[PDB]
Symmetry: C3
Subunit: 332 residues, 3 copies
């Protein structure tokens, strides 16, 4: 059974096919690839773009999306095995998955880490659980990786440079400020897709503490070795931005401090200058700037940068609808 948990699990040929069908669905939004079918969208965290682009994509394809929010409407799920359920968890994913598997044709899930212990959050238990017990294809709507966002990003880029081949482009994935520590998910997915697309990726972040987990720094290496691109870390802003083609901002907490954020507040606070501003965008080769959104203005980026024509975040967001339709149509 084929799922869509990470782009990494897919071959370059399949990804390529996915971006093209995306491009296609973008030319003709309506179809019947999902006529009579349906998908259960399970959210354990907030969402606007994801929720909306999926709910519409299913409608635009003849299917129907059923949104579920365990804890709000649906019953809270248990993921640990053999555990004795006498706490707050009402049912077990082993039953929930097999059941959704009787009503729907697809299952999408969204569950940000709990931020208490990275060791435990890096196992991506919810998504893996779903994938294991579900008799139907499972789709990552973001956990510790945001595969869907990756393709939307990749397409917005291929669109911008007028070609599918993005090799040779200097891609700068920059960390950026945020009053509180956020999920690394997108940063990981960015690094993964940027390296996979064969670009000259530069992971810009404040201190070595902010470097992404090894798994992802390693997936990146294999991608370079494959796409003939390159990965590189930089703690110096200007040296990075210097003549870039693409610039993706994303704030996230330092993994080492998981479960111990107190000592990090003072640390991140001294890097607010990482915000993406015109000055930095000036240092680029008329580069394009993007973000997954929701973006906090004048914190992650400046009003100028957002209103700037080089900001393709809106297009990238819209592609989420086309990319996801390609993923669903594929999986069925």
């Amino acid at each position: 059974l084929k799922h869509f948990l990470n782009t990494q699990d897919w071959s370059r040929a399949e990804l390529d096919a996915l971006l093209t069908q995306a491009a296609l669905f973008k030319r003709n939004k309506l179809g019947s690839e999902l006529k009579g079918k349906s998908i259960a969208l399970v959210f354990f965290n907030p969402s606007m773009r994801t929720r909306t682009s999926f709910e519409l994509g299913a409608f635009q394809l003849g299917g129907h999306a059923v949104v579920l929010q365990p804890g709000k409407d649906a019953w809270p799920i248990e993921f640990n095995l053999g555990t004795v359920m006498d706490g707050d968890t009402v049912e077990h994913i082993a039953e929930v998955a097999r059941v959704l598997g009787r009503y729907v044709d697809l299952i999408g899930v969204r569950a940000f880490p709990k931020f208490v212990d990275w060791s435990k959050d890096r196992e991506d238990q919810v998504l893996k659980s779903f994938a294991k017990y579900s008799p139907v294809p499972v789709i990552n709507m973001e956990t510790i990786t945001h595969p869907c966002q990756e393709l939307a990003h990749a397409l917005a880029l291929q669109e911008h440079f007028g070609t599918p081949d993005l090799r040779g482009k200097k891609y700068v994935l920059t960390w950026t400020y945020h009053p509180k520590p956020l999920n690394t998910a997108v940063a990981n997915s960015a690094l993964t897709i940027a390296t996979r697309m064969g670009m000259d990726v530069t992971l810009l972040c404040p201190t070595p503490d902010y470097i992404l987990d090894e798994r992802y720094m390693d997936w990146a290496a294999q991608n370079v070795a494959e796409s003939g691109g390159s990965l590189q870390v930089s703690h110096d802003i200007d040296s990075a931005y210097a003549g870039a083609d693409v610039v993706y901002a994303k704030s996230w907490g330092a993994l080492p401090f998981f479960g111990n954020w107190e000592p990090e507040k003072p640390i991140r606070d001294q890097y607010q200058h990482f915000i993406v501003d015109e000055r930095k965008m000036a240092l680029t080769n008329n580069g394009v700037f993007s973000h997954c959104l929701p973006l906090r203005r004048n914190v992650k980026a400046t009003d100028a940068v957002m209103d700037s024509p080089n900001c393709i975040a809106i297009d990238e967001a819209e592609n989420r609808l086309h990319v996801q339709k390609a993923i669903m149509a594929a999986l069925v």
Copy 2:
């Protein structure tokens, strides 16, 4: 780009056309004016009638409604410009609108005032923001005015009197009791539509403190001067109800006391007799009584009055579905 923020922005010819298409949709509920299209319903406050009649109207027209509740499911939005987003607001309406604008064909928004400072609430910032940044038509689902409800009301009336011409009818818009101060929105919209329809509007309320904002009292004046009707204020019950044709109840807090309700509690509390009862309905020319709902029984109106055959609140509510389908079909 044409929106539907207020009936006032529309010419009488257009409104007239809207009520007729409403009457039409009421004869044949199913159509394809929205085939393949969709609308994002953004609610910052509770709703039953609005949510339901829109969600169904879109379905009855081949479209699809995507309900969003910033703060519950979707991410909380920021409306102030240049502000530095390091608080509770996660994204800015400038991005949210442009984005929804990539997924949907229409956007509906509902945001009651915050009741802290009328000066700030009277600017209808959320609706105006949406209208400004959205590349697609925006629809007022109620803010400081309830345009949609107006047409539902106007149609229920034209239906009741068997004619579109409601001139000459004595329309009494009466304030009514409620333990807590409520939005003036409906009262404004009532005054606006009643005067616009050319009736003999009488704004009945306890003290001059309860008279509606100037903007609305002025829109009303221009409507009289146009429709050849009349506006009038009354602090005396009986003199008002006296031989009326229409009676619309609605409770709301006194604008002067915005942000300072403590001193108003004792004031409203001494007007509970404003409740709509049989006695008052007796003083009318076999008039018809209505309310936008949700109505608190035996507080705003008496059980008798509601169960009375002259109560057309249920029909008025149902029209909300027909009126709104006319508005959507129009806007696309």
Copy 3:
């Protein structure tokens, strides 16, 4: 006007017809029995299976479901008559029903008891209110009885034994442990359907305190007298499980202790051994085990029992979708 509040209100011929159309819809999921129609699903409590199977069933039949959650999205309703609404209730069911009656073709409602006073909860006020004021057919999505679940259960059984006639089968409806006291609804519905299907029902529970309300113990009697089966109470486990064909577990609080659960905690706590385990399932005539779900693993049943092939809870759950489509198609 015909509703679906309880299976009891229906004749055996109608129920029989319902299970067959269910079996049918199970062979061909898509249809147009609900083309253009819609149903308002009102939930005053959490739900996963019910919400999802209804929302999809309506979609699979050309209709549209509109989910409403009074208190979350929709406004909180008042059910008591003549009461003076100056509290938390915003509108009255008399208006809500008549209104939904103008937008939808069907209304489903879910409202678990309040657990404060059984005397008051046994009147099933919400469902009865809905049925009374609604001009359209009302469907019990579970209150003090779970009619829908009954048919899903009955079908999963007829499917398992390869025949519609389940007479002669030893049906053991066993109470089971749960840290907190739960609704008796399902237990009642089980007793009702098991006896109605003409099986040898045995109500297994700890102490006479746990025996279900008289109404249900009496409906059961009349069912036996009709279906030629039998009802029986057992406080001894083994004597019950002993060579059974069907085993339905369900935890619920002792009715006598309604509003006074303190003194029951210590009582239920000494019956955790009621959990359904392999040992007990061994004592059965290769019986089949089921539960309505959501089930708390290693509390109500053991991991073994759930993963056991005799556990038909997943199939029973899936039937909820087929059974409910038969109920809707019928009611319109």
